[PDB]
Design an enzyme around this catalytic site. Structure first.
Site, mmCIF file in Angstrom:
data_model
loop_
_atom_site.group_PDB
_atom_site.id
_atom_site.type_symbol
_atom_site.label_atom_id
_atom_site.label_comp_id
_atom_site.label_asym_id
_atom_site.label_seq_id
_atom_site.Cartn_x
_atom_site.Cartn_y
_atom_site.Cartn_z
ATOM 1 N N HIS A 24 1.094 -1.195 -0.085
ATOM 2 C CA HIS A 24 -0.062 0.496 0.254
ATOM 3 C C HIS A 24 0.699 1.285 -0.271
ATOM 4 O O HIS A 24 0.014 1.993 -0.031
ATOM 5 C CB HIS A 24 -1.254 -0.297 1.439
ATOM 6 C CG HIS A 24 -0.415 0.172 2.242
ATOM 7 N ND1 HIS A 24 -0.047 -0.984 3.603
ATOM 8 C CD2 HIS A 24 -0.045 1.531 3.379
ATOM 9 C CE1 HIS A 24 0.657 -0.688 4.364
ATOM 10 N NE2 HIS A 24 0.486 0.748 4.507
ATOM 11 N N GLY A 47 3.840 5.145 10.768
ATOM 12 C CA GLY A 47 4.901 4.849 10.378
ATOM 13 C C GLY A 47 5.365 4.098 10.001
ATOM 14 O O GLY A 47 6.563 3.794 10.082
ATOM 15 N N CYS A 92 4.393 0.577 9.105
ATOM 16 C CA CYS A 92 4.298 -0.287 8.767
ATOM 17 C C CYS A 92 5.927 -0.594 8.225
ATOM 18 O O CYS A 92 6.523 0.761 7.378
ATOM 19 C CB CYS A 92 3.093 0.261 7.674
ATOM 20 S SG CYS A 92 3.058 1.678 6.796
HETATM 21 C C1 LIG Z 1 1.492 2.253 7.562
HETATM 22 O O1 LIG Z 1 0.142 1.654 7.095
HETATM 23 C C2 LIG Z 1 1.675 2.182 8.936
HETATM 24 O O2 LIG Z 1 3.063 2.594 9.660
HETATM 25 N N1 LIG Z 1 0.581 1.072 9.177
HETATM 26 C C3 LIG Z 1 1.212 0.795 10.755
HETATM 27 C C4 LIG Z 1 0.292 1.246 11.937
HETATM 28 C C5 LIG Z 1 -0.547 2.521 11.688
HETATM 29 C C6 LIG Z 1 -0.921 2.925 12.574
HETATM 30 C C7 LIG Z 1 -0.912 3.102 13.994
HETATM 31 C C8 LIG Z 1 0.098 1.342 14.643
HETATM 32 N N2 LIG Z 1 0.441 0.925 13.388
HETATM 33 C C9 LIG Z 1 1.476 4.054 6.818
HETATM 34 C C10 LIG Z 1 1.598 3.997 5.708
HETATM 35 C C11 LIG Z 1 1.388 5.485 5.461
HETATM 36 C C12 LIG Z 1 0.440 5.602 4.807
HETATM 37 C C13 LIG Z 1 0.002 7.363 4.080
HETATM 38 C C14 LIG Z 1 1.200 7.911 4.699
HETATM 39 C C15 LIG Z 1 2.526 7.897 5.504
HETATM 40 C C16 LIG Z 1 2.511 5.947 5.995
HETATM 41 N N3 LIG Z 1 -0.126 4.279 7.596
HETATM 42 C C17 LIG Z 1 -0.551 5.181 8.344
HETATM 43 O O3 LIG Z 1 0.621 5.468 9.342
HETATM 44 C C18 LIG Z 1 -1.957 5.088 8.744
HETATM 45 C C19 LIG Z 1 -1.968 7.262 9.180
HETATM 46 C C20 LIG Z 1 -2.843 6.898 7.078
HETATM 47 F F1 LIG Z 1 -2.067 7.421 6.382
HETATM 48 F F2 LIG Z 1 -4.038 7.264 7.411
HETATM 49 C C21 LIG Z 1 -3.126 5.662 6.586
HETATM 50 N N4 LIG Z 1 -2.358 4.715 8.071
HETATM 51 C C22 LIG Z 1 -2.691 2.925 8.002
HETATM 52 O O4 LIG Z 1 -2.772 2.531 9.109
HETATM 53 C C23 LIG Z 1 -3.468 2.451 7.179
HETATM 54 C C24 LIG Z 1 -4.019 1.090 7.693
HETATM 55 C C25 LIG Z 1 -5.345 0.349 6.954
HETATM 56 C C26 LIG Z 1 -3.800 0.156 5.304
HETATM 57 F F3 LIG Z 1 -4.972 -0.707 4.488
HETATM 58 F F4 LIG Z 1 -3.604 -0.792 5.789
HETATM 59 C C27 LIG Z 1 -3.407 1.185 5.058
HETATM 60 C C28 LIG Z 1 -2.528 2.326 5.857
#
Ligand SMILES: *[C@@](O)(C(=O)NCc1ccccn1)[C@@H](Cc1ccccc1)NC(=O)[C@H]1CC(F)(F)CN1C(=O)C1CCC(F)(F)CC1
Ligand SMILES: *[C@@](O)(C(=O)NCc1ccccn1)[C@@H](Cc1ccccc1)NC(=O)[C@H]1CC(F)(F)CN1C(=O)C1CCC(F)(F)CC1
Ligand SMILES: [Cl-]
Ligand SMILES: [Cl-]
Ligand SMILES: [Cl-]
Ligand SMILES: [Cl-]
Lengths: 304, 304
Positions: free
Chosen positions: B41, B143, B145
Site C-alpha cells: 500500500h 509509520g 508499516c
Molecule cells: C503504515 O501503513 C503504518 O504505519 N501501519 C501501521 C500502524 C499504523 C498506526 C498505528 C500502528 N501501526 C502507514 C503508511 C503511510 C500511509 C500514508 C502516509 C504515510 C504512511 N500508515 C499510517 O501511518 C496510517 C495513517 C494513514 F496514513 F492515514 C494511513 N495509516 C494506516 O495504518 C492504514 C491502515 C489500513 C491500510 F490498509 F493498512 C493502509 C494504511
C-alpha cells in the site's frame, strides 16, 4: 498504540562483543577501539576468590595469558591494565565496528537495555531498571559476566552497566564501565545480599499516563492531592518520595492527557489503598515501575 | 536466574532496514540481496484505500516513482513486482549486510521478536506472540508499516511478520514475507476487527515450569489430573485445548523440575478456579501466555 517493554536495537553493541579467556575462566568483554573491557575476575582462579589481591594477581600475568576472540578471529593482547573492577586489555586491532560511545553511570530508577552474551556471542536483548537498592532484576546464567547494558541516543551508545554476578535472591549486580560497582557489593565470595528495595514512584505515574494515552481510564478520579499528602501515603506503601522535579518531568505527559500530575497522584493513592479490584492496566494486574517518563514518551504517540 | 521477555539480538535485521517512498507515502522496507520488500500500500493514495485495484495501480507506476534510501545512500529501483500484499522492488545494489535468512510463516501461539522502525531507522526491539486470533499485541505508531518480526537460529534469520496496520482494539495485523495476511484481514479501509481470542495453554504451563526453575513453588499441589478433565476445565476459562504433542514438548521442562505435565495441569486448574490469592509468579499477578516451551528452555538454566 500498545505498550511493551522495548529495548534499544542491539546491533551497535553486538559488533563490540568478544570472548576473553584467561586460564580455564572464560567470559565476555566489550571491544571499543583497541581496548577490550571485561570483568577483572577473569584473571582469578577459584581459590583466589575469598580475598584476592587483584593487583598481585595481575602483576603475575602476561599478555600471552589472555585469549581474546572476536568471532573466529584471534586478537592479540599487547597490553593490560586494571581500572577498579574492570580489566582493560589493549589489543593489536582497533574494532572497525566501534560505534560512537560514552561511559555514563546511571541513577536508580533509570532504565537500560541489556545484551545477554555467552562466550562472546550475543544471546538476547531485554529492558531493565536500576532498582533503588542498586540491583537489577535481570535474566542471566553462568557465563554472562561481561554482558553490558546501554542506552542509545542519536546513534551514540551510552554504556552504563557491565554484568558481574548474581545475588542470593536471584537479582543481579555489576559495575559501570569504569569498574565501579552499583551498590554495596564486591567482586568476591561473601554473604552479600541486596538491601531492602522500594518502588519507583515517578515511573508508576509515567506508566499510568501511558495507560491513559492507550485508553485505560477506569482508575481515574476527580480528586486532587497535595504533594505532601501524596508523599505521606507513599511512605506507607514503600514508594519513593515524589519531588517537584519529578512533577516537572511528568509535565509533557500531563499536558498530552490533560490530567495534572497531582490528580494522577490521587489516582495512585486510591489504587494503593483499594487495590485494582479485579481490573488490569496495560495488560498488568500490578503497578509497573520500570518505565521512565522518557520511555513512555518515546513509545507513546503524541496524540491522546 | 531470572526471567524476562527477551528478544533476539536485532543487528542482523537492522542492517536490512530501508526507507521506501512513493509519492507522499513513506514507510519501511526490508532489503535482502537486491530486493526490497515492503507493504504494497506504499503505492496507494489516500483516495485509493476504499477498494484499490492494486494491479492497476502498479501498472501505472514506474521505477523512478520509487525512492529507496539505505541510511543516506540512494538505491535505484531497476524493477518492481507484487507478491500478494507485499511489493518487491529490485534495486541496483545487493545488500552487503544480508544475513542468512528464510521466510517462514509462524503458528498461533509462537513468539517472535519485532524491530519497530520508522523512516527506515530502527527504533526498538521487543518480543511478541502470534495470538490465537492472528493479531499481535504489539507497540506500533504511524509509520511503522514495513517493520518485521523474526526469529534467529544458528545465525539464520527466519522472517515471519511484516507489519501493516492497527485494528480498532489497538492490536496489530500484518502478513508473512510472502504477503499473505495472518488472520482474516485486508490491506484496505473497512470495519475489520479482531475475532475473539483465547489463552495459549501450553505457554502458560511452560511459564509455570519457568517459575518452578526460578523458585516459585507455592502454586504446586499433590494432585494429578487426566488430559481430558484438564481440557474440560480449559474450555470454561477460554483456554486452548492441550494436546498430547503439547505434553511431549513440555517433556524436557517436566524432566528438569520433576513435575509431570499432568501434575502441573492440576496446578493450573487450581489457579484458574481459585485465582492467585494475592501472590505473584515471576513478578506477574496474571497467568502469562506469551512464552513458548522453547523460550523457557532457551532462557532458563538446565539446573533446578
Ligand atoms: C503504515 O501503513 C503504518 O504505519 N501501519 C501501521 C500502524 C499504523 C498506526 C498505528 C500502528 N501501526 C502507514 C503508511 C503511510 C500511509 C500514508 C502516509 C504515510 C504512511 N500508515 C499510517 O501511518 C496510517 C495513517 C494513514 F496514513 F492515514 C494511513 N495509516 C494506516 O495504518 C492504514 C491502515 C489500513 C491500510 F490498509 F493498512 C493502509 C494504511
Ligand atoms: C561470570 O562471573 C558470570 O557469569 N557472572 C554472572 C552470573 C553468574 C550466575 C548467574 C547469573 N549471572 C562467570 C565467570 C567464570 C568463572 C569461572 C569459570 C567460568 C566463568 N562466573 C560464573 O559463571 C559463576 C560460576 C563460578 F564459576 F563458580 C563462579 N561464578 C560467579 O558468578 C562468581 C560470583 C562472584 C564473583 F566475584 F563475581 C566471581 C564470579
Ligand atoms: Cl572511553
Ligand atoms: Cl512518539
Ligand atoms: Cl527469498
Ligand atoms: Cl540455557
Amino acid at each position: 498504540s500498545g505498550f511493551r517493554k522495548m529495548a534499544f536495537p542491539s546491533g551497535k553493541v553486538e559488533g563490540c562483543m568478544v570472548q576473553v579467556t584467561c586460564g580455564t575462566t572464560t567470559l565476555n568483554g566489550l571491544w571499543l577501539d583497541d581496548v577490550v573491557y571485561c570483568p577483572r575476575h577473569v584473571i582469578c582462579t577459584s581459590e583466589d576468590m575469598l580475598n584476592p589481591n587483584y593487583e598481585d594477581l595481575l602483576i603475575r600475568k602476561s599478555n600471552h595469558n589472555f585469549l581474546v576472540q572476536a568471532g573466529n578471529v584471534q586478537l592479540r593482547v599487547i597490553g593490560h591494565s586494571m581500572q577498579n573492577c574492570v580489566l582493560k586489555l589493549k589489543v593489536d586491532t582497533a574494532n572497525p565496528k566501534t560505534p560512537k560511545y560514552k561511559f555514563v553511570r546511571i541513577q536508580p530508577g533509570q532504565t537500560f537495555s541489556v545484551l545477554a552474551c555467552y562466550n562472546g556471542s550475543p544471546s538476547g536483548v531485554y529492558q531493565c531498571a536500576m532498582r533503588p537498592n542498586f540491583t537489577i532484576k535481570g535474566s542471566f546464567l553462568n557465563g554472562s559476566c561481561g554482558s553490558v547494558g546501554f542506552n542509545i541516543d542519536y546513534d551514540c551508545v551510552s554504556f552504563c552497566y557491565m554484568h558481574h554476578m548474581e545475588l542470593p535472591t536471584g537479582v543481579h549486580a555489576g559495575t559501570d564501565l569504569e569498574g565501579n560497582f552499583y551498590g554495596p557489593f564486591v567482586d568476591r565470595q561473601t554473604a552479600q545480599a541486596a538491601g531492602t528495595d522500594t518502588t519507583i514512584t515517578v515511573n508508576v505515574l509515567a506508566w499510568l499516563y501511558a495507560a491513559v494515552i492507550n485508553g485505560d481510564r477506569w482508575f481515574l478520579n476527580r480528586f486532587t492531592t497535595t504533594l505532601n499528602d501524596f508523599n505521606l501515603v507513599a511512605m506507607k506503601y514503600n514508594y519513593e518520595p515524589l519531588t517537584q522535579d519529578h512533577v516537572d518531568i511528568l509535565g509533557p505527559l500531563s499536558a498530552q492527557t490533560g490530567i495534572a500530575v497531582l490528580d494522577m497522584c490521587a489516582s495512585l493513592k486510591e489504587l494503593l489503598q483499594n487495590g485494582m479490584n479485579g481490573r488490569t492496566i496495560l495488560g498488568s494486574a500490578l503497578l509497573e515501575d520500570e518505565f521512565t517518563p522518557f520511555d513512555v514518551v518515546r513509545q507513546c504517540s503524541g496524540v491522546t
